[PDB]
Design an enzyme around this catalytic site. Structure first.
Site, short mmCIF file in Angstrom:
data_model
loop_
_atom_site.label_atom_id
_atom_site.label_comp_id
_atom_site.label_asym_id
_atom_site.label_seq_id
_atom_site.Cartn_x
_atom_site.Cartn_y
_atom_site.Cartn_z
N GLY A 75 -35.83 1.51 -15.18
CA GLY A 75 -36.93 1.20 -14.28
C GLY A 75 -37.98 0.27 -14.85
N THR A 76 -38.49 0.58 -16.04
CA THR A 76 -39.52 -0.28 -16.63
C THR A 76 -38.98 -1.61 -17.13
OG1 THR A 76 -41.42 -0.29 -18.14
CG2 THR A 76 -39.40 0.73 -18.96
N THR A 115 -24.56 5.53 -16.86
CA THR A 115 -25.53 6.45 -17.42
C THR A 115 -26.47 7.05 -16.37
OG1 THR A 115 -25.47 5.34 -19.57
CG2 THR A 115 -27.44 6.61 -19.08
N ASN A 145 -26.50 -2.86 -31.61
CA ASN A 145 -27.72 -3.61 -31.81
C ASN A 145 -27.64 -4.54 -33.01
OD1 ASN A 145 -28.58 -2.07 -29.70
ND2 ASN A 145 -30.01 -0.82 -30.88
N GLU A 176 -31.82 -27.88 -25.25
CA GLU A 176 -30.51 -28.47 -24.99
C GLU A 176 -29.55 -27.51 -24.30
OE1 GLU A 176 -28.90 -30.19 -28.50
OE2 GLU A 176 -30.72 -31.30 -29.00
N1 LIG Z 1 -26.80 -1.92 -26.08
C1 LIG Z 1 -27.76 -1.02 -25.93
N2 LIG Z 1 -27.97 -0.43 -24.71
C2 LIG Z 1 -28.95 0.49 -24.55
C3 LIG Z 1 -29.75 0.84 -25.61
N3 LIG Z 1 -30.63 1.76 -25.17
C4 LIG Z 1 -30.41 2.00 -23.86
N4 LIG Z 1 -29.37 1.21 -23.46
C5 LIG Z 1 -28.77 1.12 -22.12
O1 LIG Z 1 -29.70 0.65 -21.16
C6 LIG Z 1 -29.70 1.48 -20.02
C7 LIG Z 1 -30.91 2.39 -19.99
O2 LIG Z 1 -32.07 1.60 -19.93
P1 LIG Z 1 -33.40 2.09 -20.67
O3 LIG Z 1 -33.81 1.08 -21.71
O4 LIG Z 1 -33.23 3.47 -21.25
O5 LIG Z 1 -34.48 2.09 -19.49
P2 LIG Z 1 -36.04 2.04 -19.80
O6 LIG Z 1 -36.41 0.63 -20.20
O7 LIG Z 1 -36.43 3.03 -20.87
O8 LIG Z 1 -36.69 2.41 -18.38
P3 LIG Z 1 -37.33 3.85 -18.09
O9 LIG Z 1 -36.24 4.89 -18.12
O10 LIG Z 1 -37.97 3.84 -16.73
O11 LIG Z 1 -38.36 4.15 -19.15
C8 LIG Z 1 -28.43 2.29 -20.11
O12 LIG Z 1 -27.35 1.56 -19.56
C9 LIG Z 1 -28.24 2.44 -21.60
O13 LIG Z 1 -26.87 2.56 -21.90
C10 LIG Z 1 -29.54 0.25 -26.85
O14 LIG Z 1 -30.25 0.56 -27.80
N5 LIG Z 1 -28.55 -0.68 -27.01
#
Ligand SMILES: Nc1nc2c(ncn2[C@@H]2O[C@H](COP(=O)(O)OP(=O)(O)OP(=O)(O)O)[C@@H](O)[C@H]2O)c(=O)[nH]1
Ligand SMILES: Nc1nc2c(ncn2[C@@H]2O[C@H](COP(=O)(O)OP(=O)(O)OP(=O)(O)O)[C@@H](O)[C@H]2O)c(=O)[nH]1
Ligand SMILES: Nc1nc2c(ncn2[C@@H]2O[C@H](COP(=O)(O)OP(=O)(O)O)[C@@H](O)[C@H]2O)c(=O)[nH]1
Ligand SMILES: Nc1nc2c(ncn2[C@@H]2O[C@H](COP(=O)(O)OP(=O)(O)O)[C@@H](O)[C@H]2O)c(=O)[nH]1
Ligand SMILES: [Mg+2]
Ligand SMILES: [Mg+2]
Ligand SMILES: [Zn+2]
Ligand SMILES: [Zn+2]
Ligand SMILES: [Zn+2]
Lengths: 430, 442, 52, 77, 442, 430
Positions: E143-144, E178, E227, E253
């Site tokens: 969401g964020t 997820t 990561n 570019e």
């Molecule tokens: N590759 C990767 N994917 C991630 C990581 N952390 C979360 N995700 C993925 O990103 C999605 C979840 O998004 P989040 O970053 O948790 O969402 P948010 O920005 O915290 O938004 P809010 O829940 O409202 O706070 C899922 O598909 C997770 O699998 C990470 O460290 N690396």
């Protein structure tokens, strides 16, 4: 490639206790369940029958079923009993009454859901599932009825896997139960549709093995069940150890069964010899082959000399030459050529495994598909028709709820099985 | 001058272990992939390249894949002594076997494993600058060897095209047998081997067993002996690519000289100085004696008698201390013999090769050490007798549909039995027709 | 994730366990047939040269 | 086919190269509207890496060309 | 020369930890930013300046902001090992999350937090003299990340104007998932991202899991491995700014070479020598081998197969010991392949870059040490399949208004769902139209 | 992000005592209130449930309300009772009489203002307030009436926050009081309007957990309240410890409720196993997932197999890979696809937290939204209809002042909730 075992009724639980003793001994598992073995070769295939519990321990992938917990308390009380997972013991509150209809319809439907839940839980945990293995008697009550019920449910849920049974059948000379023909006929009717491979053992044949070959003074069911556990553990040996020519339950079925109804087999195990005589003759492939084909060493009352071999299989354990296996199987086929079905050019499959059972230099287990099995079914069908024509004990089964049409269907299907064996007996090239 | 080896199923992997053991010991690569240098000054030499490629750090790695559907034998290789020689991706293993069913291998199970194999074979062929064929080792009696070998040869034939494919094939022996369903798998294996191979050499274990009982003094041989003999044969045939010699022979010359018509590509193989160490110091081993040996039926590695047929072409490989004049004198003496007959349309029946590198001796081996050897591959009409016995056993079983429900259940039409049996019947008629003298002149 | 001497003893024990397999009762034919015999065989390099 | 021998087709494995023009067409919602539907991956009850999974998840495994000799088969292509 | 990094939400901050770990260790700045007590300057040269600025006393501080609505991840950064590296104002944290609602992030809460973020970014941009773009890391599934990332990119696009904005975006995987509401957030994100981003690189965790199982030997991977791979990719793309090379490539570019029409800016990414330490010593790793590797779908970090579409442009970045003649020979061999197709209106399909600095090795890392690597970003019509599956799942849920009351409660009109769905449908039609051959239209 | 707890009636106060024992243990707070812990991870989120009073002490953010002081004497006699703030105990002088109308209308309106004053005093002290947590039974008198009254007042004052309830509902099999159906029906009417998310527990399910899984010889209400306190303390764990994929009560609500009336949830906690069995099974993510979806481990009498899952959530505690979690949730969704509502493409949310509960290596709590919950309400409605047709005990309620139309209105609202669940169960794509 892991097997899930089911043990049903008194006979099944008793045979199972000796089987799991033999298996735990070959892989060096202490009766506490701790691994105490001395080679990595033991560990590298332990998964086939055991699951791993934490810090060393292994637990055996088996389901125990009975209608009164008395047997369960006896098996739990045995010397290896502790190894079994407590949650794996399933029991009811009232007996089969030695009645097939009770075991199939009344207490069967009461317990079967908890057994199917446990069997599915165990099966779906496997990374790749091989066939199921079931031990039961056909003459009993809960063994026959609930065993065939469970077989039908597992065949619905896993139709692409293998279904294998080891089964005890009534001797031709003395009955242990009066109503044996009904329970046997109904169970054979269920098996011939549902089963993939069925092995048959007569207690009379084990008594004759002990008395004639081993000259034992005071045999007990522990000896008969040890002989059975030895052959049972021998059939799976190529699944779980290296060898020059690996083999598998499906490869055995493909080479043994020509047509899908003809899946009932005779069993034997060769290096049986009395402690006094053993000093006089060393082990070699001719000695094992000669005992292996001697009808004295076969675990059924029917004799091969009244029939013909469609197919046979021999599994060898030990460090041995390919010459002795190939040339012996050729020589035996050539000298006794009248006893082999002529429209198959080679009836015997061989397999060789490096690791023998402890304390024997060599061993072979023999599986045979022979038309003399028709005599057992004919005898059971005659005794059934004598009892059924007179309504001899039928009110028990009808009072449980069975339709009389089941008895006539099962009789007709078994009679057709006998006819099919007789037809293949007298076939010719023309 | 590179070649890629493909090993399929149980026989093919076990024969591969003996082959790569021999090729390592012959070139001198240690089991860890390093070649211990002997001279401090000079060029490194480069002979391994036919079978090995070196990394920039100088480790050697071999040009092979190992294919199986059951894990146990390949996991044994992974845990054995040569663990570090092979790249781990090259050793490919499935979950469960083809259960002696060609149909199960071809339709159900091999389709899952085949794409990894094709990616590895592609990665090898991209790392070449001269490629002159694929060598394939398999048995046609078992399920995965037949079914996946056929499927993979078909895919290779589409993807690689003109590149040559030479097969070493273990056929069902004429009276020793190991499984009931061997005729069905061997018949179905036919079309795959007829249209998707360039030369196929057929071997039967009963002949190599006879050779090891009669010539060597081994009462109780086992597969490691047979596999070491096969490895020796392959080393003799590929030596012409790898070492200096008077008359080299490229793999395309075999196809040009041995194959008269495009279907007539099945050849017999034999090897001469199979001899024990105690006999070897009692006898000289001149060129004419070993040349006389390769034509005796006691020397062959396939159970057929060529006196019941006619030769069309012979290819004779001599390795070691031999002089061309002696080879010519020997071939002229063979030509003089009355029990050796050539078809009248093939007057110049022989191809020769002469290489200076003598055969290697393996520490655990059973062959003696000898200064010279000869190896023969030959095309003869006698081979037609092997098919007639396979067809009789198939006809006996198929007349009553003895096992067909397994094959139909695993995905195959019943029609495929009759089609394959008619194609092999036409191959029998081809071998009958080609050997008939041109008595009719119009 | 460094290793204490106890961990070193465990690692050495595992290496000994791997080395001492295929003993008298557990000998397969790959173990007794295919071994390391490089030091016993003779190597000839007279008839092999470098390509140009 | 030719005399006294069977072709690859007869056995059921045509060996021509694919039609690359059709292969390079993206599979969008309009495509599924025209033929079939639901671009979602079909769910399966078998373990991953098992032949049932590949049978009911991928097109290459489920494909089956016609079988039969060209003389008896109408062919119509 | 300089670039500013913006990290949003959970994935973006966690990927930021790996990125700044790598950039510190590659330039040589200590994790706390200080210097030994006897030196007057911590490092001899200014090359760090692209990512770090030094104070007059020589402490280093990095050009980044970390944005989150929940405190926990930023509080982990505040208490971790890099506490002294970051300026405390850069680590911005709210009170409560956007609860997987795009509407909550965009309308209610991110609208409150966004002005602090813009003030911090402005304070960074005032301390620059040749800013040449923004790098943004976020996931569009949450969401964020979706709502505030879109809102912030809109404001940035008004305030900074022509300056380039390059996004690294984690999209919802095609069958790993997820959260239930992923399709709504991803559709609305893609709707905002179409207008306000110059190039967007898409990543899927399912592809990096596949890559870590096949190439690396990791049985139980976790987000830190993914990561670290992402950090390596970003370091490869930005290396052209920081070290000497034959053919440099400025961040402006990429947009000029990769984007044919203003909506067609979504690109696939892959990296060649993703390899484990045990495999790395069994193989040579020449230029042509890694060039052949980057086009195989097993190398990609997004779950799409490019064989189902047509390439419009490719950009190939080589770093390490590579010679231009080998790059040219490799690219010509790639061009020869038949499963690689370019639209007929794009004849000159390639951009090349060549840099001398080999990839850095991280103490806890899982990649092997290698002398050279290549990284590719490419525009292809195959991407249309990912959107079609997201749109179908959106249509399935939206037919019953399955969750819409949350979005309407957090401040959004119901009309916005339908608008976004027609815009993504039009993007699908754009990918159909761009791929139509010119020879077919005459 | 602070939670305020409310405990109402005997069941609520007793469950609360065990809940605050578990929370005080996890943060290392002595029963005197002194911090004695050994890591900063304990301290850095202590504010979430405790306020800090001067010179060391911590106080727990909870309000205790009851109509007879008997419970206060029971909580005061427990091992942790001293920790509670004296001003937070509110009690009357005479009981609810097991009557909803008495508890709601006569003593309810008399006490409720002092409870609202205490709840507001506690809420306004937080720097940012997260949802409320309430424990009560629906079958009682003061629990149902005053709990739902207070819930309605808190919903008036804080409509944008979360309202969470844990609620005990009368077994169909065992009851301590005759008038349970009226109180239950009126309480369900109040909850479906006021609540954001509601969890339902059957005492019958806790007895069946204790007898079959834990094999306790002599279970007591303390064991049932320990199981409940375990799940209650588990749901909030991701709020107050670090993790790889953080989660929050609001994200659970957003993912679980498709439409605002469909806010009734199932509960589970995975690591349950008898002291004899514990030697038999090592911990792993598949084992936790397998127990987590087994209906045996679910705290309601309705079984999921009679319904379909709209949505589900799993919260994992411990050091574990994310790949194993995602692939387990994929495999469960793929193999059982008929039990998941088809117009939602993915039903399961996962979350992962680093810090497990003390003495466990790993744990998961499961929340499920399944339409088979409609069966519980139908049974309660049946018993209500049996009593109501005959006006069986209505004069007590009417003497308090209730109109009979109230009973028919509440019945109609429950019938509409059952109808709405049944309609969404049988919906289709078309
Ligand atoms: N590759 C990767 N994917 C991630 C990581 N952390 C979360 N995700 C993925 O990103 C999605 C979840 O998004 P989040 O970053 O948790 O969402 P948010 O920005 O915290 O938004 P809010 O829940 O409202 O706070 C899922 O598909 C997770 O699998 C990470 O460290 N690396
Ligand atoms: N020369 C030689 N022949 C072998 C060897 N192993 C097996 N064979 C022969 O090959 C045939 C058996 O084929 P297999 O290789 O076991 O079949 P497979 O490839 O394993 O096929 P599946 O049983 O379905 O797995 C028999 O005729 C064996 O005698 C070997 O190591 N050397
Ligand atoms: N070989 C063997 N046979 C047994 C054993 N126990 C019982 N039997 C035989 O099995 C038959 C009795 O079946 P039973 O197990 O009592 O049936 P149940 O009542 O359904 O469990 C008789 O033929 C017994 O001789 C045993 O330990 N070993
Ligand atoms: N699980 C559980 N149930 C309880 C407990 N105390 C009472 N109950 C049950 O709740 C019902 C009595 O309700 P009660 O709490 O006395 O209502 P109240 O008088 O309004 O507070 C009966 O079914 C009791 O069995 C407890 O501590 N745990
Ligand atoms: Mg095999
Ligand atoms: Mg978050
Ligand atoms: Zn073909
Ligand atoms: Zn769909
Ligand atoms: Zn044809």
């Amino acid at each position: 490639r892991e097997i899930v075992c089911v043990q049903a009724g008194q006979c099944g639980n008793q045979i199972g206790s000796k089987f799991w003793e033999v298996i735990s001994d070959e892989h060096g598992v202490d009766p506490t369940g701790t691994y105490q073995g001395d080679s990595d070769l033991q560990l590298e295939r332990i998964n086939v029958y055991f699951d791993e519990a934490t810090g060393g321990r292994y637990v055996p992938r088996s389901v125990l079923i009975d209608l009164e917990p008395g047997t369960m308390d006896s098996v739990r009380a045995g010397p290896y009993g502790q190894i079994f997972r407590p949650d794996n013991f399933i029991f009811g509150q009232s007996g089969a009454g030695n009645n097939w209809a009770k075991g199939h319809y009344t207490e069967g439907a009461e317990l079967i859901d908890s057994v199917l839940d446990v069997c599915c839980k165990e099966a779906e945990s496997c990374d790749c599932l091989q066939g199921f293995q079931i031990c039961h008697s056909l003459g009993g009550g809960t063994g026959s009825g609930m065993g065939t019920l469970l077989i039908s449910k597992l065949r619905e849920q896993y139709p692409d896997r293998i279904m294998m049974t080891f089964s005890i059948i009534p001797s031709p000379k003395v009955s242990d139960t009066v109503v044996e023909p009904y329970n046997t006929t109904l169970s054979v009717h269920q098996l011939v549709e549902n089963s993939d491979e069925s092995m048959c053992i007569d207690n009379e044949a084990l008594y004759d093995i002990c008395f004639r070959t081993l000259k034992l003074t005071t045999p007990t069911f522990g000896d008969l069940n040890h002989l059975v556990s030895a052959v049972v553990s021998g059939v799976t040996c190529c699944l779980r150890f290296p060898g020059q020519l690996n083999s598998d339950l499906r490869k055995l079925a493909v080479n043994l069964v020509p047509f899908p109804r003809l899946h009932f087999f005779m069993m034997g195990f060769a290096p049986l010899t009395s402690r006094g005589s053993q000093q006089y003759r060393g082990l070699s492939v001719p000695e094992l082959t000669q005992q292996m084909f001697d009808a004295k060493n076969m675990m059924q009352a029917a004799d091969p000399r009244h029939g013909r071999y469609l197919t046979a299989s021999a599994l060898f354990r030990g460090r041995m030459s390919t010459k002795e296996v190939d040339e012996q199987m050729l020589n035996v086929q050539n000298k006794n050529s009248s006893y082999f079905i002529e429209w198959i050019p080679n009836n015997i499959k061989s397999s060789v495994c490096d690791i023998p059972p402890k304390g024997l230099k060599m061993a072979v287990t023999f599986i045979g598909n022979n038309t003399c099995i028709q005599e057992m079914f004919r005898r059971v069908g005659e005794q059934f028709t004598l009892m059924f024509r007179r309504k001899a004990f039928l009110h028990w089964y009808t009072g449980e709820g069975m339709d009389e049409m089941e008895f006539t269907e099962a009789e007709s299907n078994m009679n057709d099985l006998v006819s099919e064996y007789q037809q293949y007996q007298d076939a010719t090239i023309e | 001058r590179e070649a890629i080896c493909i090993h399929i199923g149980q026989a093919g992997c076990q024969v591969g272990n003996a082959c790569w053991e021999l090729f390592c010991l012959e070139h001198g690569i240690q089991p860890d992939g390093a070649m211990p240098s002997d001279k401090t000054i000079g060029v490194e030499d480069d002979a391994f390249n036919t079978f090995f490629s070196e990394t920039g750090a100088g480790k050697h790695v071999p040009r092979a894949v190992f294919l199986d559907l059951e894990p146990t034998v390949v996991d044994e290789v992974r845990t054995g002594t040569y663990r570090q020689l092979f790249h781990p991706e090259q050793l490919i293993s499935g979950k469960e076997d083809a259960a002696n069913n060609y149909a199960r291998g071809h339709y159900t199970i091999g389709k899952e494993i085949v794409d990894l194999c094709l990616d590895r074979i592609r990665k090898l062929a991209d790392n070449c600058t001269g490629l002159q064929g694929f060598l394939v080792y398999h048995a046609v009696g078992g399920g995965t060897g037949s079914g996946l070998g056929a499927l993979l040869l078909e895919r290779l034939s589409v993807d690689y095209g003109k590149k040559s494919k030479l097969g070493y094939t273990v056929y069902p022996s004429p009276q020793v047998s190991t499984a009931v369903v061997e005729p069905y798998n061997s018949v179905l294996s036919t079309h795959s081997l007829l249209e998707h191979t360039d030369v196929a050499a057929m071997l039967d274990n009963e002949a190599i067993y006879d050779l090891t009982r009669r010539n060597l003094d081994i009462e109780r041989p086992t597969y490691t002996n047979l596999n070491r003999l096969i490895g020796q044969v392959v080393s003799s045939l590929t030596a012409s690519l790898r070492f200096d010699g008077a008359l080299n022979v490229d793999l395309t010359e075999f196809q040009t000289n041995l194959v008269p018509y495009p279907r007539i590509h099945f050849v017999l193989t034999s090897y001469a100085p199979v001899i024990s160490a105690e006999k070897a110091y009692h006898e000289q081993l001149s060129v004419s004696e070993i040349s006389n040996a390769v034509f005796e039926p006691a020397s062959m590695m396939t159970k057929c008698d060529p006196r019941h047929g006619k030769y069309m072409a012979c290819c004779l490989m001599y390795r070691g201390d031999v002089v061309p004049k002696d080879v010519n004198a020997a071939v002229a003496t063979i030509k003089t013999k009355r029990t050796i007959q050539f078809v009248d349309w093939s007057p110049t029946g022989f191809k020769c090769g002469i290489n200076y590198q003598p055969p290697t001796v393996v520490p655990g081996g059973d062959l003696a050490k000898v200064q010279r050897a000869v190896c023969m591959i030959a095309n003869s009409t006698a081979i037609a007798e092997v098919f007639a016995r396979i067809d009789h056993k198939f006809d006996l079983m198929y007349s009553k549909r003895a096992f067909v429900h397994w094959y139909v259940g695993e995905g195959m039409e019943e029609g495929e039995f009759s089609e394959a049996r008619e194609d092999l019947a036409a191959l029998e008629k081809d071998y009958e027709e080609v050997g008939a003298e041109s008595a009719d002149m119009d | 994730h460094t290793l204490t001497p106890v961990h070193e003893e465990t690692v050495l024990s595992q290496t000994q366990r791997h080395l001492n397999r295929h003993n008298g009762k557990w000998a397969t034919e790959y173990s007794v047939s295919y071994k390391d015999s490089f030091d016993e065989a003779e190597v000839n390099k007279a008839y092999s040269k470098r390509s140009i | 086919h030719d005399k006294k021998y069977h072709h690859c087709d007869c056995y059921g494995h045509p060996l021509g190269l694919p039609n690359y023009k059709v292969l390079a067409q993206p599979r969008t919602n309009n495509y599924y509207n025209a033929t079939g539907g639901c671009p979602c991956i079909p769910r399966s009850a078998a373990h991953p890496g098992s032949w049932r999974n590949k049978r009911e998840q991928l097109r290459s495994t489920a494909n089956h060309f016609p079988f039969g000799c060209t003389k008896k088969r109408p062919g119509t292509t």
